[PDB]
DNA sequence: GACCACGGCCAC
DNA sequence: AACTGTGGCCGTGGTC
């Protein structure tokens, strides 16, 4: 293009280069803008941010987050990544999008600015006539990008000293287990190396191998294999406890305290908006969507996520969300009635599994019932179900048989979804979000049936993800007017931060917004809690 | 140092 | 192990 002087006219597309992927930690190396067949390159990128009224272009949110870090309100606008993502959610990176729609993603701000301009023109053209995708763009994704930027720049408070203390405690317990594993094995080795562990269990000891690994065909040492050997030899039990502790220490307890930001004093994740095949968000650097919650030690870790002094955390989580979505998408009269009566299938399955009254279902039990209910739903095999529940094969077929005959319209919707996917090549959510699934007519059975399971899962998971995104878009401005903050999204859950004297009002309002976001044929029910820490608030 | 594949495992 | 699905991060082992 023709090189013009900074600043650019209003409505220009931005290009920028960061020292590293994380916007809260990145040095803004370069900044440029393109419009009207010209390119503007900024002499000093930080100063030049003040001139922009809007971040418009590829990865707009990332630049908006960095502007918020500097005390500038530079909201993100159009982003060709979002247009490409709605056209085909396999469009996840600028490298691919550029190569697919008319450019090349380089490492220079000016070229990235001119690329953003061209890619928006072409992609906006590809979307002419796709009115449902355009609705999702204007009413969900583009406004959501602004919400995410604020969430990323706000961060979450963490009890650092608490986790440091915990690390030393967990370390001592790890050494006790390690020392005994070595004693039973008769010698020491790297207990973290699954290759070395394989030899010990299956060659040195006489333990039988139950399964092989996918890519390399080694004898597996996964938890499911060890649980099957848990009493065939004691050492296994110690290995399972070792694995749990080292997993939590190396993934959460030790890395997280070192990631507190110096200006904010808080922990900052990234909410990736074009990263999944179903329309879900993802979280990275660090992932705050997989913080432990299941085991007693996991809960000690979750307690480290706390509220600023004078504030409280508010946590909202949809009830049995993808089951309610299934009722609406399938139109099953039997299943609709289950939620109109305020029933809970996870609690029911839990009582069934454990042979105890519903009043005796602890959280750990209901947690296991969810894997069953969603495993069966999305196609688990009878044999595996028998092994997961330690019951004969015949009883497992019957559970799967009962499960689906209770709701006949479900398998009819599954088959309808698959037929539509084979005709058009894609499946879609309630709002029209698409996932292309071409393997539905593959001649290899395993490849075909895998595609099938991915195919009819996406409309359910994706619709639930659509609803949450829409709720976040509606809820955010209401929270600003109350002086509250939106902190995290965990697929079907939101964590907020609110002043203590407005905490109760915020919880009531957020609950209502999330439940009436988009009424379905079944009521959406939301559980909400308030506490000084993330665990207390659920 | 920077990559990567792999097996494994945390959450939804 | 795997006819549940969606993610991201770990250490190991390897290459460059
Ligand atoms: N094991 C799994 N397999 C497949 N999908 C899953 C699995 N676990 C969770 N999901 C999906 C379906 C859930 O509706 C959705 C949100 O998870 P989650 O909130 O834990 O469960 P839930 O909303 O069904 O129950 P709850 O009433 O406890 O909130 O994620
Ligand atoms: Mg949840
Ligand atoms: Mn839920």
- Given helix and strand content, the structural type is alpha+beta
Bound molecules: 2'-deoxyadenosine 5'-triphosphate, magnesium ion, manganese (II) ion
- Give me the CATH superfamily of the largest domain: Ribonuclease H-like superfamily/Ribonuclease H
CATH class of the largest domain: Alpha Beta
CATH architecture of the largest domain: 2-Layer Sandwich
Q: Quick one: overall form?
A: globular
Query: For the report, how would you describe the main beta sheet?
Result: 4 strands, mixed
- DSSP strand content: 5-15%
Family: Belongs to the DNA polymerase type-A family.
Enzyme class: transferase
Function: In addition to polymerase activity, this DNA polymerase exhibits 5'-3' exonuclease activity. Unlikely to have 3'-5' exonuclease activity due to absence of a 3'-5' exonuclease domain.
Keywords: DNA damage, DNA repair, DNA replication, DNA-binding, DNA-directed DNA polymerase, Exonuclease, Hydrolase, Nuclease, Nucleotidyltransferase, Transferase
A few lines on this structure:
It is an enzyme of class 2 (transferase). The protein has 538 residues and is α+β, with helices and mostly antiparallel strands.
